[PDB]
Each structure stands twice: as C-alpha cells, then as structure tokens.
Design an enzyme around this catalytic site. Structure first.
Site, PDB file in Angstrom:
ATOM      1  N   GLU A  35       0.804  -1.225   0.000  1.00 50.55           N
ATOM      2  CA  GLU A  35       0.000   0.000   0.000  1.00 50.55           C
ATOM      3  C   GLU A  35       0.842   1.283   0.000  1.00 50.55           C
ATOM      4  O   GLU A  35       0.565   2.232  -0.708  1.00 50.55           O
ATOM      5  CB  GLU A  35      -0.983   0.006   1.196  1.00 50.55           C
ATOM      6  CG  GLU A  35      -2.093  -1.081   1.106  1.00 50.55           C
ATOM      7  CD  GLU A  35      -3.123  -0.860  -0.012  1.00 50.55           C
ATOM      8  OE1 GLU A  35      -3.024   0.085  -0.713  1.00 50.55           O
ATOM      9  OE2 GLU A  35      -3.965  -1.716  -0.178  1.00 50.55           O
ATOM     10  N   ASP A  52      -6.418   8.367  -0.674  1.00 48.83           N
ATOM     11  CA  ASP A  52      -6.031   7.339   0.279  1.00 48.83           C
ATOM     12  C   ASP A  52      -4.800   7.781   1.057  1.00 48.83           C
ATOM     13  O   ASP A  52      -3.954   8.377   0.519  1.00 48.83           O
ATOM     14  CB  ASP A  52      -5.685   6.078  -0.466  1.00 48.83           C
ATOM     15  CG  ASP A  52      -6.711   5.742  -1.527  1.00 48.83           C
ATOM     16  OD1 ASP A  52      -7.837   5.403  -1.169  1.00 48.83           O
ATOM     17  OD2 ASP A  52      -6.321   5.833  -2.689  1.00 48.83           O
TER      18      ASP A  52
HETATM   19  C1  LIG Z   1      -8.646   3.778  -7.612  1.00 48.45           C
HETATM   20  C2  LIG Z   1      -8.443   2.802  -6.477  1.00 48.45           C
HETATM   21  O1  LIG Z   1      -8.771   1.631  -6.655  1.00 48.45           O
HETATM   22  N1  LIG Z   1      -7.928   3.241  -5.296  1.00 48.45           N
HETATM   23  C3  LIG Z   1      -7.905   2.405  -4.087  1.00 48.45           C
HETATM   24  C4  LIG Z   1      -9.004   2.630  -3.044  1.00 48.45           C
HETATM   25  O2  LIG Z   1     -10.214   2.230  -3.684  1.00 48.45           O
HETATM   26  C5  LIG Z   1      -8.776   1.712  -1.831  1.00 48.45           C
HETATM   27  O3  LIG Z   1      -9.849   2.027  -0.852  1.00 48.45           O
HETATM   28  C6  LIG Z   1     -10.914   1.164  -0.772  1.00 48.45           C
HETATM   29  O4  LIG Z   1     -11.943   1.680  -1.564  1.00 48.45           O
HETATM   30  C7  LIG Z   1     -12.962   0.758  -1.603  1.00 48.45           C
HETATM   31  C8  LIG Z   1     -14.048   1.238  -2.578  1.00 48.45           C
HETATM   32  O5  LIG Z   1     -14.415   2.578  -2.307  1.00 48.45           O
HETATM   33  C9  LIG Z   1     -13.566   0.597  -0.220  1.00 48.45           C
HETATM   34  O6  LIG Z   1     -14.550  -0.460  -0.275  1.00 48.45           O
HETATM   35  C10 LIG Z   1     -15.863  -0.259   0.119  1.00 48.45           C
HETATM   36  O7  LIG Z   1     -15.962  -0.165   1.485  1.00 48.45           O
HETATM   37  C11 LIG Z   1     -17.247   0.098   1.935  1.00 48.45           C
HETATM   38  C12 LIG Z   1     -17.149   0.368   3.420  1.00 48.45           C
HETATM   39  O8  LIG Z   1     -16.619  -0.744   4.083  1.00 48.45           O
HETATM   40  C13 LIG Z   1     -18.188  -1.081   1.548  1.00 48.45           C
HETATM   41  O9  LIG Z   1     -19.363  -0.887   2.105  1.00 48.45           O
HETATM   42  C14 LIG Z   1     -19.742  -1.916   2.976  1.00 48.45           C
HETATM   43  O10 LIG Z   1     -20.151  -3.076   2.313  1.00 48.45           O
HETATM   44  C15 LIG Z   1     -20.378  -4.091   3.263  1.00 48.45           C
HETATM   45  C16 LIG Z   1     -20.458  -5.391   2.523  1.00 48.45           C
HETATM   46  O11 LIG Z   1     -21.261  -5.167   1.421  1.00 48.45           O
HETATM   47  C17 LIG Z   1     -21.675  -3.861   3.983  1.00 48.45           C
HETATM   48  O12 LIG Z   1     -21.912  -4.959   4.832  1.00 48.45           O
HETATM   49  C18 LIG Z   1     -21.427  -2.587   4.775  1.00 48.45           C
HETATM   50  O13 LIG Z   1     -22.512  -2.120   5.472  1.00 48.45           O
HETATM   51  C19 LIG Z   1     -20.890  -1.464   3.880  1.00 48.45           C
HETATM   52  N2  LIG Z   1     -20.517  -0.341   4.688  1.00 48.45           N
HETATM   53  C20 LIG Z   1     -21.014   0.868   4.478  1.00 48.45           C
HETATM   54  C21 LIG Z   1     -20.473   1.868   5.445  1.00 48.45           C
HETATM   55  O14 LIG Z   1     -21.854   1.198   3.658  1.00 48.45           O
HETATM   56  C22 LIG Z   1     -18.192  -1.256   0.016  1.00 48.45           C
HETATM   57  O15 LIG Z   1     -18.876  -2.433  -0.401  1.00 48.45           O
HETATM   58  C23 LIG Z   1     -16.756  -1.346  -0.495  1.00 48.45           C
HETATM   59  N3  LIG Z   1     -16.621  -1.261  -1.945  1.00 48.45           N
HETATM   60  C24 LIG Z   1     -15.986  -2.161  -2.611  1.00 48.45           C
HETATM   61  C25 LIG Z   1     -16.131  -2.110  -4.101  1.00 48.45           C
HETATM   62  O16 LIG Z   1     -15.316  -3.024  -2.080  1.00 48.45           O
HETATM   63  C26 LIG Z   1     -12.529   0.268   0.843  1.00 48.45           C
HETATM   64  O17 LIG Z   1     -13.007   0.329   2.144  1.00 48.45           O
HETATM   65  C27 LIG Z   1     -11.317   1.169   0.694  1.00 48.45           C
HETATM   66  N4  LIG Z   1     -10.218   0.621   1.503  1.00 48.45           N
HETATM   67  C28 LIG Z   1      -9.609   1.356   2.419  1.00 48.45           C
HETATM   68  C29 LIG Z   1      -8.440   0.674   3.095  1.00 48.45           C
HETATM   69  O18 LIG Z   1      -9.919   2.470   2.721  1.00 48.45           O
HETATM   70  C30 LIG Z   1      -7.322   1.733  -1.319  1.00 48.45           C
HETATM   71  C31 LIG Z   1      -7.153   0.514  -0.412  1.00 48.45           C
HETATM   72  O19 LIG Z   1      -7.837  -0.559  -1.042  1.00 48.45           O
HETATM   73  O20 LIG Z   1      -6.498   1.444  -2.434  1.00 48.45           O
HETATM   74  C32 LIG Z   1      -6.541   2.351  -3.495  1.00 48.45           C
HETATM   75  O21 LIG Z   1      -5.825   1.851  -4.590  1.00 48.45           O
END
Ligand SMILES: CC(=O)N[C@@H]1[C@@H](O)[C@H](O[C@@H]2O[C@H](CO)[C@@H](O[C@@H]3O[C@H](CO)[C@@H](O[C@@H]4O[C@H](CO)[C@@H](O)[C@H](O)[C@H]4NC(C)=O)[C@H](O)[C@H]3NC(C)=O)[C@H](O)[C@H]2NC(C)=O)[C@@H](CO)O[C@H]1O
Length: 129
Positions: A35, A52
């Site tokens: 990361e 990020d």
């Molecule tokens: C361009 C690029 O790819 N950059 C990267 C960043 O994307 C990445 O950060 C991660 O980003 C993803 C997508 O935005 C994010 O994932 C989402 O997280 C949310 C919150 O947890 C999920 O929502 C939840 O879903 C669960 C299961 O369905 C539910 O039970 C729950 O209630 C939901 N929560 C909420 C609050 O609504 C999304 O489903 C999920 N999206 C996807 C597609 O997975 C990550 O959390 C981000 N990660 C971090 C560490 O912040 C960064 C690290 O991966 O990397 C960059 O490259």
C-alpha cells in the site's frame, strides 16, 4: 516516517492488529508494504476524487474527512491528516473498523492482489515480537 519491516511489525502488534478479525500479523505488514512501502506520509488520489492516506492507504470516501471528497463519509471520525502521522495509532484504530465492516481485508486492494493466499508469515521473519 518510513518504518522498517520489523519496526512496523512490532508497532502493529503492540496496537493489537496481530490476529485482529483473524488476520495474522504478516497480513498487515504485507498489506502495508504494498500500500505505502511502509511510509506514513503516503498519499494517492483515486479516480473519483477521494484520496487514500497513510501506511494502510485509508480512503477518504468512507473513513476519514479531508474536506475535499463531497458526499463521502468519515466513519473513523478523524481528519485524514491524522493518518499521515509518525505515530500509527490512528491508522491502526481506523483499520480495525475497516476490516470489521464486512469484506475483511479485501478492503485493501493490494492485499487481495499481492498478499492474500501467499506465505504472509515470511513478512515477519527475523522480527523479535
Ligand atoms: C482507484 C483505487 O482503486 N484506489 C484504491 C481505493 O479504492 C482503496 O480504498 C478502498 O476503496 C474501496 C471502494 O471505495 C472501499 O470499499 C468499500 O468499502 C465500503 C465500506 O466498508 C463497503 O461498504 C460496505 O459493504 C459491506 C459489505 O457489502 C456492507 O456490509 C457494509 O454495510 C458497507 N458499509 C457501508 C459503510 O456502507 C463497500 O462495499 C466497499 N466497496 C468495494 C467495491 O469493495 C474500501 O473500504 C477502501 N479501503 C480502504 C483501506 O480504505 C485503497 C485501499 O484498497 O487502495 C486504493 O488503490
């Protein structure tokens, strides 16, 4: 701050990440390596305008406030700048929430693509923990 491998391992262990939600320590060190290259001041911009932050690349879309991601959440209730500190406390405490939120460590793309399934224990070889 750029952490050493074992230095970061020790800090992550101190802060309770070892086996947190079932993820052994090497998983967290591996994730951090890819990361941020162990660099607390790492930042990267996502296509949609979120950013990020820090050693575990925590996304302003969901987890922190940077004032420049409209429509986003701040689920760790912190400024994104706090995730750039030499002190990893805020990043670790926020990562605890992220890994709990349903998708486990698949929240970290570099982890899913580069660490998941691999011999992650090797990332703690040689460390005094
Ligand atoms: C361009 C690029 O790819 N950059 C990267 C960043 O994307 C990445 O950060 C991660 O980003 C993803 C997508 O935005 C994010 O994932 C989402 O997280 C949310 C919150 O947890 C999920 O929502 C939840 O879903 C669960 C299961 O369905 C539910 O039970 C729950 O209630 C939901 N929560 C909420 C609050 O609504 C999304 O489903 C999920 N999206 C996807 C597609 O997975 C990550 O959390 C981000 N990660 C971090 C560490 O912040 C960064 C690290 O991966 O990397 C960059 O490259």
């Amino acid at each position: 701050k750029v952490f050493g491998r074992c230095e970061l391992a020790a800090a992550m262990k101190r802060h309770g990440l070892d086996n947190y939600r079932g993820y052994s320590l090497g998983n967290w060190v591996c994730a951090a390596k890819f990361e941020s290259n162990f660099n607390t001041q790492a930042t990267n911009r996502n296509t949609a305008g979120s950013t990020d932050y820090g050693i575990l690349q925590i996304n302003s879309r969901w987890w922190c406030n940077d004032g420049r991601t409209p429509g986003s959440r701040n689920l760790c209730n912190i400024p994104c700048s706090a995730l750039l500190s030499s002190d990893i406390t805020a990043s670790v405490n926020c990562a605890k929430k992220i890994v709990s939120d349903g998708n486990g460590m698949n929240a970290w793309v570099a982890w899913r693509n580069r660490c998941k399934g691999t011999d992650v224990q090797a990332w703690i070889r040689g460390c005094r923990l």
